[PDB]
Design an enzyme around this catalytic site. Structure first.
Site, short mmCIF file in Angstrom:
data_model
loop_
_atom_site.label_atom_id
_atom_site.label_comp_id
_atom_site.label_asym_id
_atom_site.label_seq_id
_atom_site.Cartn_x
_atom_site.Cartn_y
_atom_site.Cartn_z
N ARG C 89 0.59 -7.06 2.76
CA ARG C 89 0.07 -5.76 3.16
C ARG C 89 -0.46 -5.77 4.60
O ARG C 89 -0.38 -4.77 5.30
CB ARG C 89 -1.04 -5.32 2.20
CG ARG C 89 -0.65 -5.35 0.73
CD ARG C 89 -1.89 -5.15 -0.10
NE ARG C 89 -1.70 -5.07 -1.54
CZ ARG C 89 -1.56 -6.11 -2.36
NH1 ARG C 89 -1.50 -7.36 -1.88
NH2 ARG C 89 -1.45 -5.90 -3.67
N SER C 102 -2.81 9.64 14.15
CA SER C 102 -2.18 10.96 14.18
C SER C 102 -2.64 11.83 13.00
O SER C 102 -3.10 12.94 13.19
CB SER C 102 -0.66 10.80 14.14
OG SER C 102 0.00 12.04 13.90
N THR C 120 -2.99 4.10 1.60
CA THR C 120 -2.08 3.39 2.50
C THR C 120 -2.54 1.96 2.81
O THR C 120 -3.71 1.72 3.01
CB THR C 120 -1.91 4.16 3.81
OG1 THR C 120 -1.58 5.53 3.50
CG2 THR C 120 -0.77 3.52 4.64
N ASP C 149 -6.78 -3.69 -8.52
CA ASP C 149 -6.91 -5.11 -8.88
C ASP C 149 -7.85 -5.32 -10.06
O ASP C 149 -7.53 -6.09 -10.97
CB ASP C 149 -7.38 -5.94 -7.69
CG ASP C 149 -6.65 -5.57 -6.43
OD1 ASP C 149 -5.69 -6.29 -6.08
OD2 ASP C 149 -7.00 -4.52 -5.83
N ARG C 152 -6.00 -4.46 -13.13
CA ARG C 152 -5.00 -5.47 -13.53
C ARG C 152 -5.68 -6.65 -14.20
O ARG C 152 -5.23 -7.14 -15.23
CB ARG C 152 -4.24 -5.96 -12.30
CG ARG C 152 -3.19 -4.95 -11.82
CD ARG C 152 -2.81 -5.18 -10.36
NE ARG C 152 -1.65 -4.35 -10.01
CZ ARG C 152 -1.27 -4.09 -8.76
NH1 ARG C 152 -1.96 -4.59 -7.74
NH2 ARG C 152 -0.19 -3.34 -8.54
N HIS C 176 -8.17 -6.01 -0.86
CA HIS C 176 -7.06 -5.67 -1.76
C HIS C 176 -5.84 -6.42 -1.22
O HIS C 176 -5.08 -5.91 -0.38
CB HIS C 176 -6.82 -4.17 -1.73
CG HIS C 176 -5.59 -3.73 -2.45
ND1 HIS C 176 -5.44 -3.88 -3.81
CD2 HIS C 176 -4.46 -3.13 -2.01
CE1 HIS C 176 -4.26 -3.40 -4.18
NE2 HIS C 176 -3.65 -2.94 -3.11
N1 LIG Z 1 -3.67 0.78 -2.42
C1 LIG Z 1 -2.75 0.37 -3.30
O1 LIG Z 1 -3.10 -0.17 -4.48
C2 LIG Z 1 -1.31 0.67 -2.99
C3 LIG Z 1 -0.33 0.54 -3.98
C4 LIG Z 1 0.99 0.87 -3.66
C5 LIG Z 1 1.32 1.30 -2.39
N2 LIG Z 1 0.33 1.39 -1.41
C6 LIG Z 1 0.65 1.85 -0.05
O2 LIG Z 1 0.83 3.25 -0.17
C7 LIG Z 1 1.65 3.66 0.95
C8 LIG Z 1 2.71 4.63 0.43
O3 LIG Z 1 3.61 3.94 -0.39
P1 LIG Z 1 4.85 4.70 -1.07
O4 LIG Z 1 5.53 3.83 -2.02
O5 LIG Z 1 4.43 6.06 -1.52
O6 LIG Z 1 5.79 4.90 0.25
P2 LIG Z 1 7.03 5.93 0.27
O7 LIG Z 1 7.99 5.42 1.31
O8 LIG Z 1 7.55 6.23 -1.08
O9 LIG Z 1 6.32 7.20 0.86
C9 LIG Z 1 5.69 7.25 2.12
C10 LIG Z 1 5.52 8.71 2.51
O10 LIG Z 1 4.70 8.78 3.70
C11 LIG Z 1 5.27 9.88 4.44
N3 LIG Z 1 4.81 9.86 5.82
C12 LIG Z 1 5.12 8.78 6.75
N4 LIG Z 1 4.42 9.26 7.94
C13 LIG Z 1 3.86 10.43 7.69
C14 LIG Z 1 3.09 11.24 8.50
N5 LIG Z 1 2.90 10.86 9.75
N6 LIG Z 1 2.57 12.45 8.04
C15 LIG Z 1 2.79 12.95 6.66
N7 LIG Z 1 3.58 12.00 5.86
C16 LIG Z 1 4.08 10.79 6.38
C17 LIG Z 1 6.75 9.60 4.37
O11 LIG Z 1 7.46 10.77 4.78
C18 LIG Z 1 6.88 9.38 2.88
O12 LIG Z 1 7.00 10.65 2.23
C19 LIG Z 1 2.26 2.36 1.52
O13 LIG Z 1 1.45 1.95 2.60
C20 LIG Z 1 2.02 1.37 0.41
O14 LIG Z 1 1.87 0.05 0.95
C21 LIG Z 1 -0.98 1.09 -1.72
#
Ligand SMILES: NC(=O)c1ccc[n+]([C@@H]2O[C@H](COP(=O)([O-])OP(=O)(O)OC[C@H]3O[C@@H](n4cnc5c(N)ncnc54)[C@H](O)[C@@H]3O)[C@@H](O)[C@H]2O)c1
Ligand SMILES: NC(=O)c1ccc[n+]([C@@H]2O[C@H](COP(=O)([O-])OP(=O)(O)OC[C@H]3O[C@@H](n4cnc5c(N)ncnc54)[C@H](O)[C@@H]3O)[C@@H](O)[C@H]2O)c1
Ligand SMILES: NC(=O)c1ccc[n+]([C@@H]2O[C@H](COP(=O)([O-])OP(=O)(O)OC[C@H]3O[C@@H](n4cnc5c(N)ncnc54)[C@H](O)[C@@H]3O)[C@@H](O)[C@H]2O)c1
Ligand SMILES: NC(=O)c1ccc[n+]([C@@H]2O[C@H](COP(=O)([O-])OP(=O)(O)OC[C@H]3O[C@@H](n4cnc5c(N)ncnc54)[C@H](O)[C@@H]3O)[C@@H](O)[C@H]2O)c1
Lengths: 314, 313, 313, 314
Positions: C89, C102, C120, C149, C152, C176
């Site tokens: 990550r 942004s 994110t 976590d 899990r 995390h």
């Molecule tokens: N915290 C956690 O437990 C956990 C778990 C899973 C995923 N994540 C993180 O969540 C994030 C999203 O994962 P995902 O599987 O949904 O990705 P994904 O690719 O399915 O979706 C990402 C979305 O972000 C959008 N996006 C990118 N830039 C943008 C912007 N500037 N403005 C508005 N939208 C924007 C993209 O268009 C897309 O729709 C990743 O960083 C992933 O690592 C965190």
């Protein structure tokens, strides 16, 4: 493919409050109510039915009789005499054992083969009696026990530490009554050791004592103020009912038969136990510190001594 | 960033049952209880708090006083005299109007600026009194009204047709009391015309009448059996409270102020209305057949005539 | 008298699953969705709206833009790059910090003044960035952190001990990610000492290690199998959202700003914290045994060292 | 005293979404997932399990195989081919009948004796096929049918009249597809006649048409935007599942076998039906106006004609 059916026996303050909880929570789809006082049953069944259109899912409420227990899944007994100001729960054993002999007999005669959940006081001895009278496996006879004491202990701690009750893991075990004990060796909020934290406060020892005293004597305090308690136990009964019908394997402190756990046998007493669709799956045996070991043993002995003197149990 | 706060005034059979409903449902996170009978309040607040560790989400219960209303979001009034066997709800008007003049005055003096929800009988007249005594906009004063009669009607129909109550769409409108009327032009299960179907049965007219009579007279029947009613109304009050705090725009039959709808004015009476966080958003105006128009106008007149004679009003 | 409004930014696997969780749970009455990919948003908003007639209470879903944040109560950010098989990550930091500069700027320009909830990755650093970019108080910026976590860990323990997950009180704290740590000094079922009990079994040390390894590496295992994770995090985000909107004062392990607690400062990291309508009320400081103290300090240092090198930060 | 057990067959967009609904809603305590794609099953089961600690009550999720159906209470089938932009649901009958022959055969072989709930398209014909293939009573084979179309119709009406969807009683009946019809003679909000009210508006006739067109063509509109639909159907499936396990006797529009109701026989089609723990208790027969009678008959004939040409059904 039958639904879930509860028969409530005893429709006074506690029973009717439990019935209203079931109408709010939609744990089961069918509730049948039995009481000697048929007119109050009639009045409550109507009043309750009129609430059901707003229940999350269908609940059917009806007045019943013992024959209705034949295919009941859970029989909840809240019937019997209650304590007056200045009385203890054990002060009721005689009259309520008389009553349970009759009730459980009428139930078994209908060919009932489900689970019993008992609230009538003294609840540990009455659960034991229901087990003995009924002939049913221990897994299928439950007393509400310290489900309520544990909730009170958690509630008082949530106030003392200013967090949600859901975030306080704390337990009362032993007799649902004067020999009950707090499990301070366990009580915590996300790992904060509550007794240790309280002891650090000014007159912390005093506060630790008040919290337990207000737990132990809550029923007396409420009875002094309004004559009877019913909401806490109704909610506790609802919680157990939920763990059963949603098959949860949830650990709850209830009155359970011990057969060697905690070094005790032949006594129903408040302990953590795993609850599912089959009733009590098993007693959960937790480490107790020396003070807790000593108090738990004394509580078991207190109950066992009173049972040995109850002629109805012979 | 405030939570949701309800103050209950009147902690008797109805009030305490409503409080227990809120402990079961976790509609709001804070409940404050006021009654002249402070011992009953202390006792109920304790018993209720002990149920809260099993509530779906946190609910804090406490004993309060009028000053606690300053930042309350909803004040629910269940205080006052109830009816005896043999009495109507209208019989209570003078006694309960005097009580409301006092309660509402004490609430407004706290600087309360939320919503009122009234159950005390006669509920339509007392909702009207609450509106007038408080000076608040009509959207912010609600009587429980036919929330309960509609439920009873649905319950009896659900038994007559053997389906879930939530599958019966049926309504009682008018006074919460003897001049109330069933909306048979509407009552249906997935479109089954319930009055028409009942009329097809042997002695169907009789069944149709008995269903409404048992709806209209339910309170009397329950009182005869156990001395008072409380679960039905508590549940109905909880339903309204949910529509508010979950901002639903749900249509519910409640006592609302009419200002032209159904060709009536200056009267609180049971009608379908849209309920959201702001209270009653608007009254819903449904088509009534000739019988229903007749009975609704009669119900309105009956209430207005009583209000016209009320010293306090 | 406003309802409860959530704006989701980032409607991918995680965002849309969170949105569906909100449609199932009815935590809030209004959900607005923003993504660069407007076609996916239009498609999801439609599909979601069609689920809402069966929601427990009203939920309105709509496609939005930044201007819609002006009166939002919560902004949930799930936008940005995810990790590939083989990546950590932390590998995502530079790309996702540019994106947050942004997004957060566009939200604040709308006059938004609510709470932020960040998913994110890397979530602790991105929560910190959200706090710094937004200028908002720490109480109002939350990272999901170890909410997932901890779940899990509880799930794997609940299988090891054969009881309901809700009967296991157990916590993961720290980053995390790879420097996270189990709190074995606490983990218990009704007081059963879980590490001690596991150590009594044949190869108990091995089981103890495997339980934590499967917790720590869960994301990698799921990604290997289906390419990304989303249900666990969506559910955890919904849990936090519930604690806020139901004003619970519930203790949850989330990414929070430390200012002295655990002897760390100027870092977001997973810790138990009290959550209510105002966001994080306070961090909960629990006693850690020597091993846990060691690992927690190492986790904090690891995050702070990465933040120290981040151009955007 | 067994708990409630659901086996999901087919773990793609729809199935996995349904699984997540069950994890959010805690309708049942046990969910088993079967799919040819064992790796995605593995990944989803893990991801789903990690959500269960926040489920209202215990949900156990696991990867399964056909032998696991032996004591399943409900089998939900979401397996099979889905439509592309420019395709209709009936364009799938051939491949999906092939697949159901296999699936239902494997299920019955395990000695399954519960209820089937089918979502695979075309759902009315596939429900019919499940009934025929399985040999089970009609009460125990349900298609999702217009559960979703009715929700869309209600959703569009709630926007047009600006009230909660829960306050709109409105139904779509017939084929889950192009020959479906709105029941305007019924659709109301607390008795407000929605079609009549719309007709009073400027170009009201146009708005009445757009509302139906957006209902009928919703799947196409969503597929054009994001490639597939899944949340609406998952939620609809959850709703049916709830009516079954909470034994509700709730009326829902689902795909049911008709044997004389609406003057049709030997065809599964979307109609209001009473749902309880036993599955479909009965079809509810509502009055239809002339336009509705004509459209419903045409929908039944459309389905029956396609069935008569499906060699797999012979
Ligand atoms: N915290 C956690 O437990 C956990 C778990 C899973 C995923 N994540 C993180 O969540 C994030 C999203 O994962 P995902 O599987 O949904 O990705 P994904 O690719 O399915 O979706 C990402 C979305 O972000 C959008 N996006 C990118 N830039 C943008 C912007 N500037 N403005 C508005 N939208 C924007 C993209 O268009 C897309 O729709 C990743 O960083 C992933 O690592 C965190
Ligand atoms: N376990 C707990 O936490 C807890 C808490 C509060 C009260 N209680 C006990 O629960 C019991 C009920 O209390 P309550 O306040 O509801 O009393 P109550 O007087 O209000 O009601 C008792 C009911 O039992 C009915 N009944 C008596 N004998 C019967 C019989 N033979 N068959 C069918 N019905 C019979 C009575 O008619 C009455 O309706 C008392 O024993 C009280 O001590 C237990
Ligand atoms: N709307 C409905 O569907 C419906 C149904 C049932 C009862 N009711 C009405 O609800 C009201 C309450 O009924 P109940 O059975 O709870 O009566 P109750 O006698 O049980 O309780 C009345 C409570 O009001 C309190 N009270 C009286 N004056 C007060 C004041 N000035 N300030 C604070 N508290 C005061 C009393 O102390 C008592 O606690 C009655 O008017 C009854 O007719 C309405
Ligand atoms: N009834 C409705 O309202 C509705 C709505 C949307 C989609 N659908 C239908 O539901 C079905 C599934 O759609 P989706 O988007 O999830 O498709 P998908 O491609 O995402 O998933 C299909 C799944 O079926 C599995 N599968 C195929 N054959 C199998 C077999 N023989 N045994 C076990 N698993 C098998 C595949 O491996 C895949 O995992 C399609 O027919 C689609 O038309 C119905």
């Amino acid at each position: 493919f039958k639904g879930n059916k509860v028969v409530l026996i005893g429709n006074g303050a506690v029973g009717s409050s439990y019935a209203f909880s079931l109408v709010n929570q939609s744990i089961v789809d069918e509730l049948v109510i039995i009481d000697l006082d048929t007119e109050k049953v009639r009045g409550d069944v109507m009043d309750l039915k009129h609430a059901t259109p707003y229940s999350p899912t269908t609940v059917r409420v009806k007045a019943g009789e013992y024959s209705d227990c034949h295919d009941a899944d859970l029989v909840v007994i809240c019937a019997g005499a209650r304590q007056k100001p200045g009385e203890t729960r054990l002060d009721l054993v005689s009259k309520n054992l008389k009553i349970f002999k009759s009730i459980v007999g009428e139930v078994m005669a209908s060919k009932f083969d489900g689970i019993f959940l008992v609230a009538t006081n003294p609840v540990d001895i009455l659960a034991y009696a229901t087990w003995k009278f009924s002939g049913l496996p221990k897994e299928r006879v439950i007393g509400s026990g310290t489900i309520l004491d544990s909730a009170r202990f958690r509630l008082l701690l949530s106030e003392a530490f200013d967090v949600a009750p859901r975030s306080v893991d704390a337990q009362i075990i032993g007799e649902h009554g004067d020999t009950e004990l707090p499990v301070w060796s366990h009580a915590n909020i996300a790992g904060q050791p509550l007794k240790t934290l309280l002891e650090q406060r000014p007159e912390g020892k005093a506060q630790i004592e008040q919290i337990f005293v207000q737990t132990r004597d809550a029923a007396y305090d409420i009875i002094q103020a309004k004559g009877a308690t019913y909401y806490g136990v109704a909610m506790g009964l609802a919680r157990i009912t939920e763990a059963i019908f949603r098959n949860e394997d949830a650990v709850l402190t209830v009155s359970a038969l011990l057969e060697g756990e905690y070094e005790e046998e032949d006594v129903y007493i408040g302990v953590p136990a795993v609850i599912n669709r089959n009733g009590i799956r098993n007693v959960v045996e937790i480490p107790l510190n020396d003070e807790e070991q000593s108090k738990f043993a004394h509580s078991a002995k207190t109950l066992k001594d009173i049972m040995a003197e109850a002629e109805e149990l012979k």
